[PDB]
Design a protein around this ligand. Structure first.
Ligand code: HEC
Ligand code: HEC
Ligand code: HEC
Ligand SMILES: [Cu+2]
Ligand SMILES: [Cu+2]
Ligand SMILES: [Cu+2]
Ligand SMILES: [Cu+2]
Ligand SMILES: [Cu+2]
Ligand SMILES: [Cu+2]
Lengths: 456, 456, 456
């Protein structure tokens, strides 16, 4: 006996349902082995990795991660891979869980415009990463070529109310985090394992705000969690909750009641969550600078009745989530498009600045700019700002400490530098500030900030 | 039924006992749920991260890690957070193990001089990291804002003879490892996950030498081990022993009889150790350059009878532990204070040099400078040293190889460069050598070493 | 009762069998405790870390990893360590699994030309890393000073058909990956955890090609897998198969049916594999850039009958494995020796280029240079190449995009830059191309490529 030895395929061939993240195909719901036909197409395309930041992704099925594949242990899978004629590269696939050399790699080699096929029996139950296997393999994986395949046990997984698909990846851009424009792949950063972004589902904000996952108090949620890498290991964590179960790949071991769990590069797990009180629960890589400085956060939003005996506090806000507490940051997307066209208005900057000011500045200076008297000075109708509004550029980039006076009050505190903000972010935030709360108005341009960043 | 559903609180409210590392509050020792009141205050302050190296830590309760909190599963916790008026930043808290959004973050936002409160029921048993959750979150965590909370099971943990509290963290200074002075936080290093120090309990030597943890042969020791990060995953290991048990957070899985175990960023474990033979057992991050080049070592010292049938060897010494085999290195602290004052004496340098020479130089040249004839040349009454004592600076910084003669004996070997030693370390070591073992005397200054480091 | 309390030693002392990787000593096959005498000698020596790249390794027993030691739980081990007189450094050992301080470190300190000994009882069953423990510890470990010791349970491990020994390590060279010559240890890279190579068994290709491990369909294979570090954690994975069992050190927990598993720095595991279909199965660190850009791949080659009902595809090839699909790359070794001697022929370059062209260029331009019409242009009898063969250097280093014509066909595609190729690699590949497929002939030298790399 090999494992998964359930019989020869019965019935008619089934054309496999593939779904785009964050959704999952439905449970196969059958008691017999089948011949399952899978057709997956590779597409190379520019998408937004962040607001106003484009990247040329290489994809299985048009998304990052690629289409989710779901079969039953014991099935025979006929796997067709098409490489769209617009592709510039050849591609192939290695599916973890396949029994055989390269997990399909050699037989699935597929030049642009061609199709390949190989067949495999699904011997091993579990959740499994797949990815491209074409030299240079790391470049293909870094450009987005990974996804998950679930091989169900024969009796199926226990019923839950929702199933979702989330996959972490590390990305390597020539430019720095949130530097606008079309960003090429950066080999030197990738070789050093120094990613510029670390993301769930292929982009900043892919699962935050209006794109959050949903469920309700009392419901159970299953998440199929993959780490496509290429390089990082995820300290995968849920803020404000606990996983009832974590199960790696097809392992016999199941861990229960943990909140933080390590996912290897190329690894995958099924986690289970029971919603107990309402609010936003954040999935992160708890190597914290990834979560909070490189994009590695996703949200499961829960609706229903508060339970004050369990938790009396308020919903997550911009103090913790920063600029991702909002529904989106499309004002940034719009202001960047407008700069590229040469049609950038003051109001474009203002609305972009407003999006960016949340968390980043509001944590100390408040949402309304009032500050807190004696502790955090006001930006609302600030005489200090008005006295030399161009010095505000230096303050953002390089910080401010020492004694100062603002609206006739003394302050002796420290504003840390925020040098990681790109020129356009600083310009837009300051332009927002100048046009709010009865401040003088005017505008700061990215060119102005650039001049100041360059001053010793 | 939610978990931890034991009843409404009974009795009088309990004011929670918080302890400073490395100690732990005592077992709650009760059979009923209580309302537990926790008061924790944030304090920003300079402390010594290393000898003569100050750092502005942000702390829960005045220490890194912060005060340890201990409650019982099923308790209702009323959590008060005070931010001391000397603070420059606002702060808050996210406690892993809390059921609710942000783990307390939004309701615990607390400006300098203010107090906040929220209430939560402790549904989940286990050991859990807490940390600040204030944008920019990574900066707050990197500056020391983390600690542990234990939620006991209802029957309590099994009795052991000692309980200790150890928490790893990664730190990001503008200066290099052991560069003296007040070191600011370095954002670029933190974003790249390139820490300058990796520490247990907030400082080099915090748990070595005279600060070691203690127990005796036959006793059981429980250690609550946290990894506050922000970024690193610890290959947590005990040198010369084994953990009887390792249990992550509140997990149902318990691993037994391992010596090396991975702790995620933001993760925590309870480990158990049974002392079997006397000596020093070293807790490290076995990503070795952290343990031996960045400070990631702590010591559990065991007293009692030798058992020669089990182990015939000698106690740990400076060959392995380097300069941390000694009780402390306070001579370095003193010599650095003296340089800052402009009052540095030759004897100050000598005693600093002596502390630093252990391991670093003594492994080859021996504790008494004799060397080993033909293999390692002597520093004790060295004619080669005396012939040009200023060339000793180049030898330390850039190494020495090739044929040489010293006290009329031939040597053809390789002394590796030690360029990572800071100017003052080299000056002090050489000054020690010059004033020991009937060498010529004199002194080398940090300015001298600086001049030589700068020569091509 | 201590654990492993089986009695005082009986019979005659046994001189321990030590084996070189990838082999393992045989099972002790005994029912009583013994006094086991172990003699291990340290040797410092230059070996090839890669083709034409020498490195001064520090070794236990002449190999990296060091000799494998196998004893029975309950044995008393008398451990002799000799440091060969040619050594320049003192050395010692810390064996995980030893009960006692330093795991032997202090008593095993051994200068060049000397011998030391200590005795220990093997209380703890499992697989355990050993390594040198001599300041600076990280340098000694980085230079190759680690290996494995197995302490068998008293009844022995279950019988399998083959046992193998594989140990990952991270290496830090002054030069870049595949830069030729004698490469010194690089401390700054090591401190930053930025390795230039990541290897199984001490070298690129140590377990690929004609050095692969072997077994047959239906056979069971046990691999003792170590991670000597010094710094990296391995996302240890088998391509195209599954581990029936993974067991860390002496842990009671055994995980089954996984394909990817995290191995800590300093950790070790026993894995079990059952061969089900023929072909090459790749052991990698699935932090992918390590596997595919730094050398972290090894091969288990399986012989026997195909099973088309399980897997219909072809054997692994150069699309996935790149230049390690071949038996070896000794043409590179030879061409590098010839350059050092000043005797490099065109044919030397051609054969080196041929080795390197596999994967690296053949994935798009094909093994025969034909390309694919309209998609990948030909290198076979290429008029575009012939028109300006020196522009081929720029194409390799810096890529090519835009519209071009080659053998009267239009192309508008993208050839990515390959700037990580060293000067000699580029020269040799191009020299191969020029002398194949009726191309013009001639040669490109490393000096030519160097001149072009230096042009802005
Ligand atoms: C985010 C991008 C912003 C922007 C646009 C500003 N800040 Fe701050 N800030 C803080 C403190 C304590 C001070 C006083 C410094 C001192 O005592 O020396 C400041 C000062 C300023 C100014 C100048 C004064 C004014 O009120 O006009 C300006 C223009 C300014 N800030 C803009 C504190 C903080 C924070 C605390 C952690 C954070 C975050 C920010 N500031 C962020 C921003
Ligand atoms: C730590 C900071 C020190 C200091 C102050 C010195 N050493 Fe070494 N050393 C070693 C060897 C093999 C040599 C001979 C080199 C050769 O054969 O070419 C040396 C040489 C020196 C000298 C000059 C000779 C003398 O005896 O005066 C000096 C001044 C010196 N050392 C100081 C070997 C080692 C080590 C081996 C691994 C280590 C560690 C050190 N030395 C460290 C130091
Ligand atoms: C590995 C080292 C090699 C070598 C020696 C060459 N290539 Fe490529 N190449 C590719 C594509 C799409 C083009 C056309 C670019 C365009 O349309 O603008 C090229 C072009 C070349 C040339 C010039 C044209 C010719 O046929 O002579 C040469 C000399 C050349 N290549 C050599 C595609 C790829 C790959 C796709 C991913 C890879 C890998 C390589 N090339 C690698 C190499
Ligand atoms: Cu691809
Ligand atoms: Cu893979
Ligand atoms: Cu804080
Ligand atoms: Cu956290
Ligand atoms: Cu050594
Ligand atoms: Cu070790």
């Amino acid at each position: 006996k090999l494992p998964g030895d359930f019989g020869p395929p019965r019935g008619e061939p089934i054309h496999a349902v593939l779904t785009s993240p964050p959704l999952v195909p439905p449970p196969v719901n059958r008691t017999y082995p089948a011949k399952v036909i899978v057709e997956l197409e590779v597409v190379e395309k520019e998408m937004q990795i962040s607001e106003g930041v484009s990247y040329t992704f290489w994809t299985f099925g048009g998304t990052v991660p690629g289409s989710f594949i779901r079969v039953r242990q014991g099935d025979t899978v006929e796997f067709h891979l098409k490489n769209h004629p617009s592709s510039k590269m050849p591609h192939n696939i290695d599916l973890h869980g396949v029994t055989g050399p390269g997990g399909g790699a050699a037989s699935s080699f597929t030049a642009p415009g061609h199709e390949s096929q190989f067949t495999f029996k699904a011997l091993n139950e579990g959740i499994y990463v797949y990815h491209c296997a074409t030299a240079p393999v790391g470049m293909h994986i870094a450009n987005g070529m990974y996804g998950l395949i679930l091989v169900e046990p024969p009796e199926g997984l226990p019923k839950v109310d929702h199933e979702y698909y989330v996959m972490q990846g590390d990305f390597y851009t020539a430019g720095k985090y949130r530097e606008k424009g079309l960003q090429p792949f950066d080999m030197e950063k990738a070789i050093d394992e120094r990613p510029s972004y670390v993301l769930f589902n292929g982009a900043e904000g892919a699962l935050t705000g209006d794109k959050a996952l949903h469920a309700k108090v009392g419901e159970t949620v299953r998440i199929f969690v993959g780490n496509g890498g290429p390089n990082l290991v995820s300290s995968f964590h849920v803020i404000g909750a606990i996983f009832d179960q974590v199960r790696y790949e097809g392992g016999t071991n199941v861990q229960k009641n943990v909140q933080t769990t390590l996912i290897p590069a190329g690894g995958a797990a099924v986690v289970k969550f029971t919603a107990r009180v309402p609010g936003s629960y954040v999935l992160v890589d708890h190597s914290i600078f990834r979560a909070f400085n490189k994009g590695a956060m996703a949200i499961l939003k829960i609706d229903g009745a508060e339970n004050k005996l369990v938790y009396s506090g308020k919903e997550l806000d911009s103090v913790y989530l920063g600029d991702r507490a909002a529904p989106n940051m499309s004002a940034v997307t719009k202001a960047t498009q407008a700069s590229v066209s040469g049609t950038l208005t003051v109001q474009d900057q203002v609305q972009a600045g407003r999006a960016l000011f949340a968390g980043t500045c509001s944590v100390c200076h408040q949402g309304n700019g009032a500050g807190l008297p004696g502790v955090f000075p006001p930006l609302a109708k600030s005489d200090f700002l008005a006295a030399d509004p161009k010095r505000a550029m230096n303050i953002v980039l390089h910080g401010l400490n020492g004694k100062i006076k603002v609206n006739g009050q003394e302050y002796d505190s420290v504003m840390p530098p925020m040098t990681q903000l790109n020129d356009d972010e600083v310009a837009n935030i300051l332009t927002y500030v100048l046009n709010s709360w009865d401040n003088p108005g005017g505008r700061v341009s990215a060119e102005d900030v650039k001049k100041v960043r360059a001053q010793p």
